[PDB]
Symmetry: D2
């Protein structure tokens, strides 16, 4: 795991920011809030992300209350954003649009 | 109190489901439909949403899963046959499937 | 439907406080942090609690990071602690046991 | 690769001891699991589902309320492989908890 270089960030983050992801101030990580119609959808969303988290062995820092899911992503190994976060974020977006 | 569907309600509620892929099970008063997804992640996400609803309604599917495929059979044990509960759960299952 | 009285709180929170649940200070709700060996167990735990949440139509406020799950419980309908919270927390403890 | 006669003798006994049996007419092992309710049955399935994705090896399973029937085999080698023994071992670990 290697923190994204300034060149990678300018190339990989814009598409994520365009759909709601934003970097945190005092931390090298990205965050996004998701709002579904109900819990059935929110948890179904979480279930699919959970499966991928185990496949990639990269887990989200997330909060849920009924239909809301807030997600923060960062790589512990390299203490900051890495391709893992970009990959999981992209996967998360794929799941979300179906919800 | 669950009660099996009469001939009238079957002719009014089943055609709608047949029109979307559900068939009546041969040799048993139940309906079934095979779902195919791109992968297991999708198939299990599908199962998770149906499972939540199953507990909400206290009506469970008889299903078989192998990677990206999920085969579902619906029937009501209480009345040994199809009831409005199966029609309702099938409708919900359809909603979730279409989203994927 | 209704917020717990003083008596109910004294008679219903013991088994819960004894296992780590504590009432928040700025709001009428109880909180507890759960720690599992890994995410597989942590999410398995969440999956069982999620099913019961839909069965009871009472959902938790929870934060998860790998093997840790922080849970806060309160009833929106009555703006505070109700038996729905006592019941779900009790169920949560039962599930936590099955998760190592 | 498909398990050899020797590997099966070294890896199946422990599983057969807890209820796993080889299918007749197909190179695969299967076991019926019974839980108190669906909440437990599906919780069990979710933990197994997570591991299935982590290992990229999936079970052939049937569920009806509190019952879960699992069949394991490896498509790639048309039969039992170490992947089946490993997943079955993980499944056992989860089941003893429910």
């Amino acid at each position: 795991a290697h923190r994204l270089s300034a060149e990678e960030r300018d190339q990989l983050l814009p598409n994520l920011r365009a759909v709601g992801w934003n970097e945190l101030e005092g931390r090298d990580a990205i965050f996004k809030q998701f709002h579904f119609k109900d819990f059935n959808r929110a948890f179904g969303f979480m279930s699919r992300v959970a499966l991928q988290a185990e496949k990639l062995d990269h887990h989200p820092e997330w909060f849920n209350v009924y239909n809301k899911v807030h997600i923060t992503l960062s790589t512990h190994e390299c203490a900051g954003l890495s391709e893992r976060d970009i990959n999981l974020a992209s996967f998360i977006e794929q799941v979300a649009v179906s919800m």
